[PDB]
Amino acid sequence: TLVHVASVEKGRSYEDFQKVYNAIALKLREDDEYDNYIGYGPVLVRLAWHISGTWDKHDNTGGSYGGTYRFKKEFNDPSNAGLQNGFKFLEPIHKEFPWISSGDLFSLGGVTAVQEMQGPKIPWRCGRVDTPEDTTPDNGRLPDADKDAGYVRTFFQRLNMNDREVVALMGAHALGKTHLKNSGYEGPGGAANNVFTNEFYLNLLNEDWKLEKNDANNEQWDSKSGYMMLPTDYSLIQDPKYLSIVKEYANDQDKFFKDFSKAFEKLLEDGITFPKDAPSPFIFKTLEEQGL
Ligand code: HEM
Ligand SMILES: Nc1cc(N)nc(N)n1
């Protein structure tokens, strides 16, 4: 029964949001020591996904619109352990630009991180509006990592994502790493973990993977190169339909970039009704493109 209409922050336009993008991007460059010099890019991408991934297509609950991660129930979701680091990073940004909504800020943080890490451009639309504490979705809507391809496929149907969209989105697991204290998994998915590339797919196909137990007594796939895959990551090469798509992205960087950009924008916009006369999506310039 539930409609969330995008409403542009009063009087704001592209230039306002480019300023917010720039402040996030400059801080990404500045605060470079975080997580053993990985920097904040990966955790900001994960934050944007987790605030969006609570969405349920069946009743339009959850989703990025309401900015509900700011409330303790969601902030404290065991599935969100570690994301507090991303939230703290964004605090001074919100202080400088207090007019931006929380959902706009969290989602823009993810777009900025992807682009600054040399990923694809992600078109982004403003107008998410903060909603009250009672609209916060319950814990348990984000996915488990110990499961198989059938679980992944069914899970993502709730977010209206198909096989191609799922495999494209999972390529973000090239970024950052798993941390034992956060999730019960430990290690990175590859070498270039603060640069956005198609390495996730190459590593799935090319590494010699061993099913091992980590120090939290959970199974994960490890390679001699020091990379790891979650059981749900590895499921993408166990299922024949996912495997074909993995091979496609391993062999076509541009196609992966284009498909990721579409799926990630869609993820960040699920649940939102944009008026016919809403502004077109914004495509922000990187700091590099601006000579900044
Ligand atoms: C089946 C679906 C997925 C599962 C089970 C899953 C699970 C996980 C787990 C367990 C971690 C480690 C968290 C930690 O220990 O800090 C992680 C990290 C991460 N995830 Fe996912 N994830 C999924 C999909 C996605 C998607 C769709 C995206 C975004 C498009 C994403 C982006 C990330 C990023 C960037 C990190 C690294 C964060 C950091 O380095 O701090 N994941 N994921
Ligand atoms: N988030 C990540 C990063 C990474 N390097 N590997 C995996 N499996 N997941």
At 249, which CATH number? 1.10.420.10
Say yes or no: 93 and 197 in one domain.
Answer: no
Say yes or no: 29 and 152 in one domain.
Answer: no
Say yes or no: 98 and 13 in one domain.
Answer: yes
Is residue 75 a contact partner of residue 87, using CB atoms and an 8 Å limit?
A: yes
Say yes or no: 138 and 2 in one domain.
Answer: yes
Model resolution, angstroms: 1.5
Is residue 209 a contact partner of residue 202, using CB atoms and an 8 Å limit?
A: no
Please tell me the number of Cα atoms within 13 Å of 9 on its side-chain side.
Answer: 19
Q: Which domain holds residue 242?
A: 143-263
Say yes or no: 8 and 137 in one domain.
Answer: yes
Report the residue among 46, 112, 228 best suited for mutation to probe ligand 1: largest number of ligand atoms under 8 A from its CB. Answer: 46
Task: Give the Cα separation of 265 and 269 in Å (integer).
Answer: 6
Report the residue among 43, 49, 117, 175 best suited for mutation to probe ligand 2: largest number of ligand atoms under 8 A from its CB. Answer: 175
Query: Tokens 């605090």 label which residue?
Result: 91
Is residue 194 a contact partner of residue 176, using CB atoms and an 8 Å limit?
A: yes
Technique of determination: X-ray
Say yes or no: 161 and 238 in one domain.
Answer: yes
Find the CATH number of the domain harbouring 91: 1.10.520.10
Using CA atoms, how far residue 51 sits from 46, 61, 175, 248, in Å, is 9, 12, 18, 29
Say yes or no: 190 and 106 in one domain.
Answer: no
Residue numbers after which the chain is interrupted (C to N above 2.5 A) read: none
CB environment 179-202: b (16+ within 10 A), e (fewer): eeebbbbbbbbbeebbebbbbbbb
From 271, 278, 5, 264, select the one nearest 119 (Cα to Cα): 264
Say yes or no: 68 and 27 in one domain.
Answer: yes
Query: Which amino acid belongs to residue 266?
Result: K
Residue 47's φ and ψ, nearest 5 degrees, are -60, -50
Task: Give the Cα separation of 187 and 166 in Å (integer).
Answer: 22
Task: Give the Cα separation of 68 and 49 in Å (integer).
Answer: 13
Residue 220's φ and ψ, nearest 5 degrees, are -150, 160
Q: Long-range contacts: 12-20, Cβ < 8 Å, 24+?
A: 12/99, 12/126, 13/279, 14/279, 14/282, 16/97, 16/99, 17/100, 17/108, 17/124, 17/126, 17/282, 17/284, 18/282, 18/284, 18/285, 19/97, 20/93, 20/97, 20/100, 20/105, 20/108
Question: What's the CA-to-centroid distance between 173 and ligand 1, angstroms?
Answer: 6
Question: What's the CA-to-centroid distance between 177 and ligand 1, angstroms?
Answer: 8
CB environment 250-287: b (16+ within 10 A), e (fewer): beeeeebbebbbbbbbebbbbbbeeeeebbeebebebb
Token duo for residue 216? 């939290």
Tell the residue nearest (CA) to atom 32 of ligand 1.
Answer: 46
Ligand nearest to the CA of 174: 2
Question: What's the CA-to-centroid distance between 46 and ligand 1, angstroms?
Answer: 6
Say yes or no: 154 and 100 in one domain.
Answer: no
Ligand nearest to the CA of 178: 1
Q: Long-range contacts: 8-11, Cβ < 8 Å, 24+?
A: 8/126, 8/127, 8/278, 8/279, 9/99, 9/100, 9/101, 9/104, 9/126, 9/127, 10/99
197 lines ligand 2 (CB under 6 A): no
**Considering its fold, how many domains does the chain have in total?**
2
CB environment 125-162: b (16+ within 10 A), e (fewer): bbbbbebeeebbbeeebbbebeeebebbbebbebbebe
Task: Give the Cα separation of 4 and 135 in Å (integer).
Answer: 12
Say yes or no: 15 and 109 in one domain.
Answer: yes
Say yes or no: 1 and 122 in one domain.
Answer: yes
Beta bridge partners of 229: 221
170 lines ligand 2 (CB under 6 A): no
Ligand nearest to the CA of 145: 1
Say yes or no: 231 and 269 in one domain.
Answer: no
Question: What's the CA-to-centroid distance between 99 and ligand 1, angstroms?
Answer: 29
Task: Give the Cα separation of 104 and 281 in Å (integer).
Answer: 13
Is residue 142 a contact partner of residue 77, using CB atoms and an 8 Å limit?
A: yes
Task: Give the Cα separation of 225 and 240 in Å (integer).
Answer: 26
186 lines ligand 2 (CB under 6 A): no
